[PDB]
């Protein structure tokens, strides 16, 4: 019946604790230690990012601004390259067209040093916002897993490209429709006493993509290609022309929505042998027009880095942090030296 | 007409009257949602989020999942619901504990009273309530144990009156004393309807043959209490919520604080900036859709109708940005205030041992206001004093007597009229022998001490007799006569027995009539009949009323007694004058007929009785005066000085004269030996106006130095205060009161203290604190801002209606210095951090509209953003708002000037609000740019050349955001207890352990299909552990440096005090 409150350490707010002191002796060592630990990490990161030796060729406008009878030089405005040695011969290009007006761009460049690391080949697309809200979520996953989804059970995200001419569209999705279809030569054709260099076309997407993208079980009279697939797959889908999304890995790579309009898309790779120096040639079937999205396509050949590939943002951020720390520490030190506080007493400033 | 049978519980049940159960619960298991939902959806955040979730039901608009906002809303709703249910169960516990009590009901079959429960009582039952126990319901008395049929009820719950009321039964029905003869009475009671007018009843009780009338003279309400009677017989006529007192019960209005208004302004600012951001984003979207309509053709946009497209984009951005107003705040601050209210009534330093009464905080909505109080309207009797009385001195026949004579004036100087101090031994020596002339006056005094009172004595088994006195001064007068030698013993009705220890024989005096105490009379008169057969009148009262009604030609010692009232009033001791007169039978038989003239008028008793008594108090003979002292409470001279040191102007309201108030103020260390007293004692209203004008023009014409601005006090009387509070004159008193440091009001009417409080609070910006005792000043507490009720002996009426129940005045030194500074410093930081942690995260959704073509794409997941407000950022706020102390409580009472920091409003303002908001904006932009510079082309992985995606970057953004928020929280904390490590770093570890489990389990259930394989691309990637180290430090270095600079080179008072606490 005793209404006396308990007596302890918690009910009396008498818990043990520690109060942090912002004394300069407890602030300056912290900042100098942060600087001394961020400077080596920063220089190591910028050194690791310096070793990235890659190349990028803006092969756009090859249908109009490129020669036809011979390989004319590519303007320096487009070509970009970062190698251990200097480039002696300027990259060249030519326009070669065959039957049915199937134009193609033949690029020719020179690798001046043997690259020991593995090689990767992407296409960089600029001003193609994949992170758009109407673009990232507009694809069904059940049709990717491989099921005969009925017309009334289709995903509502792919609303415009849904059931054409009263026939269920197989790849209901804006990502599947606008697919990059510039077929690469799958091998770098060596020129002048230089052998070719084969490349791997599969095992490029994520593991979960290869594990989820299962071959469909549709027929051939109920599914129709999207409006952007009528050329390569004419007369609709058949029993043999029915694509297999489990092996067709480029489709799996393109479905992964990028983050910014300046992105890459893995197309070819080689991790089995080194790429020797010499002059190489690459054929690209000019099928994706740059006028559809207003940007600039580019063929990019890179290696691999412990952090990424030719980017110093981490290094410059480390350098900025270290510089701010080393500046403010010395500033406060000289401020307390040349003019101390001399205000430890209260002096009744109430 | 309410026809009520007497002796059959089946007959009155056909009417179907109410039962006896009292319902104090707010909710119920039957009708819970239709009221709780309407109560919850009444603020701003609740309705806003409800409209948001309602709009989030249209297709192709919601950027995230369809249930990302309703989840948190339902979570906080069920949290509020379970808290309300817990409080309802805690109230119903006491409800049932009060309702399951025992009560005795008559039985027709048993022909005797059976013991049952209170809830079983019906209208029409005959009950028998035992010795001094309260009445269960509104009963009409049938009989009683007293011979005539009277009883004494206490009405301290239905009024504030402290005396006992004589409720008597009719003599035509008081003959039913025995329980076995209760069955033979038949009849009905035609009662009135249920009302709330307490002092008016009308009924008609018909007995076996004819009807008797009823009246409020035999009506006992539920809040009353039986006293001085063995048992009574009552007939329940109103029960439950149909009584007179509990019919239309009062409701406490919503008491809002200034912090609530600042929160409202901050929420309005957040809504405005939200509208601005939405407008800017929609403008960007429409201009980019119109300007680049040719390049964005692969998306198959509309183009042909932009009126609907703009509205859809507006709705999308609204749904994306509606999380800028954190609904978690309205629950976090409420739980913090609830815990703070709990942590107040758990301190032993606020607990009274001599009474066993800790601090009881009834309302937790006014806890921070303890840190910003400027005025304190304190009472003298009960609050400052111990409310106990002790007979110290008497002055009779022109002499003066004390027991402990001090040596300053032990020598009676014989300066003509005798002034000085003599011992009580010489009082007994002039008392013993009958030959002295003054000894008949000494004995008429000493019988007036032991007979004129209204104390009911009682014996115990030990023999030490306990006196039951309605006022503690009369009880101290009786105990002073008892230990002086004239012990007062057994008091039966209409006679008084006195044990005389001088002779050893026990006398007796026949009490003829006593007239009750009245505040208009301030007298108490009692005619008596003696063993002599002679009739004498005894009268006690103040010196300001009875000295006009004497015969100054008869007595020769009036100047000595007036100088003894002058040196008594120079010590502040309350005094009473005692008068007597022999009367004859013929005038007593006429004043008896004047009393039966007042017995005929039951409609008018205040006007008739009291001035009908004053017909016979036209002349008296003075015996002398008495002096009862009231001891001051402990710590008060220190607490008041400490409160005045902090800069808190105190208004002391004393119900006495001017000199007594000045003396008790000088003794209480309220004033000083050099404090300018602006005495204002004038009667004419125009003269008071002229005095106020003279004071104000004498004060304004000259400058006020540092010593002059501090050494100023005001002293006002009752009439001057009543004439200075008019709507045309109160401004002068207000502008003259703000200049002084201590106000002392004297002779204040009870119903005017609330008037003063409402006058001060209606024309100022300060917060008041009304502390008092008894039901005489309850209106002062129910009208001020922060009410305080001291648990005392004058009745527990103020303790049940005050916001904070305190044992004594000593505790306030710790209630306003520590539990005010902390309660105002913690909530502000908590609210600022709650705003900052939300704005710093839910702003990247705006900085990202420059990269997704202003489409309104979510950067992070849908469920992770919702969990951010439930499982990751709800523990650091509670720790910084409850378990944090910026300064020790031991080094806080020593320097009360820190209270000024809370008295002005330095730790909580809209300027600091905008500062925290722009700091969050800066951090959001910093993390956004630092992430987009690293995740440039997405090629930041070394796993066989695989790339990142849209989600492995949003996860990094979210993780960096929560790390930076936790780092800022750690930088804000002041004390590193053992409960903080489980809040700030504990949340980080909880997230780092919960993310892989979630991303590995939940995606397999078609709930979060965006985390397929992100664990390898995040943890396995070397970029995560590097950005999580390079970005938080880069964002927190600025705050760290600014805090160090304000702590080192430009400190403040609390900075220096915390420095001295840390180093010493
Ligand atoms: C390449 C180098 C990079 C270097 C980066 C450096 C940036 C520094 C920027 C500004 C610092 C400027 C001067 C630094 C010198 C002094 C700073 C003064 C700071 C100041 O008193 O007011 C602050 C506002 O401060 C911002 O909220 C900060 C203002 C930020 C405003 C942001 C305006 C919008 C920016 C958006 C940019 C977006 C651009 C687009 C990018 C995205 C698209 C690409 C108030 O909040 P506060 O939480 O700190 O309050 C403090 C603090 O709580 C504590 O020290 C004190 O308590 P006590 O002493 O009792 O313990 C307290 O009394 C108070 O002083
Ligand atoms: C590589 O990817 C390129 C980008 O999608 C693609 O270029 C587009 O190809 C599609 C498919 O042919 C083109 O779409 C046709 O456009 C014409 C107008 O130029 C339309 O008339 C035509 O609709 C027709 O409708 C008829 C009645 O329904 C039907 O019978 C016809 O068969 C036909 O479907 C198509 O809508 C589009 O214009 C091309 N350019 C752009 C910028 O989209 C390449 O063909 C593709 N190449 C390969 C080898 O895959
Ligand atoms: N039985 C009594 N008969 C006549 N006068 C009494 C009295 N009891 C008190 N008084 C006087 O009435 C005056 C004021 O009215 P009241 O009786 O309500 O006392 P009070 O409310 O002022 C308590 P305090 O004096 O401690 O503030 C007191 O100063 C007192 O001298
Ligand atoms: C590895 O590279 C060789 C050439 O360097 C490839 O051989 C060519 O294959 C194509 C395929 O149609 C033929 O048209 C050429 O005539 C072949 N050239 C020679 C010289 O044999 C070989 O196919 C590559 N390996 C794989 C697995 O593709
Ligand atoms: C990676 O590139 C190397 C170099 O071209 C490939 O190795 C050649 O593979 C072809 C396959 O037909 C052989 O004919 C060549 O003899 C190989 N070159 C050497 C020097 O032995 C390798 O196959 C490529 N990796 C792939 C395609 O996965
Ligand atoms: Mg009082």
PDB file of C-alpha atoms and ligand atoms in Angstrom, chain B residues 379-385 387 653 753 771-774 776-777 794, ligand 6:
ATOM      1  CA  UNK B 379      -1.133  31.667  -1.684  1.00  0.00           C
ATOM      2  CA  UNK B 380      -0.008  32.346   1.887  1.00  0.00           C
ATOM      3  CA  UNK B 381      -2.106  30.139   4.185  1.00  0.00           C
ATOM      4  CA  UNK B 382      -1.711  26.484   3.247  1.00  0.00           C
ATOM      5  CA  UNK B 383       0.964  27.048   0.607  1.00  0.00           C
ATOM      6  CA  UNK B 384       3.603  29.101   2.431  1.00  0.00           C
ATOM      7  CA  UNK B 385       2.561  28.196   5.984  1.00  0.00           C
ATOM      8  CA  UNK B 387      -1.610  25.278   7.836  1.00  0.00           C
ATOM      9  CA  UNK B 653      -1.927  37.025  -2.328  1.00  0.00           C
ATOM     10  CA  UNK B 753      -7.780  35.817  -7.680  1.00  0.00           C
ATOM     11  CA  UNK B 771      -0.473  27.243  -6.845  1.00  0.00           C
ATOM     12  CA  UNK B 772      -2.917  27.120  -3.959  1.00  0.00           C
ATOM     13  CA  UNK B 773      -4.896  25.008  -1.526  1.00  0.00           C
ATOM     14  CA  UNK B 774      -8.532  24.392  -0.696  1.00  0.00           C
ATOM     15  CA  UNK B 776     -11.604  28.646  -2.136  1.00  0.00           C
ATOM     16  CA  UNK B 777      -9.171  29.294  -5.020  1.00  0.00           C
ATOM     17  CA  UNK B 794      -7.935  21.996   3.938  1.00  0.00           C
TER      18      UNK B 794
HETATM   19 MG1  LIG C   6      -4.853  28.772   1.362  1.00  0.00          MG
END
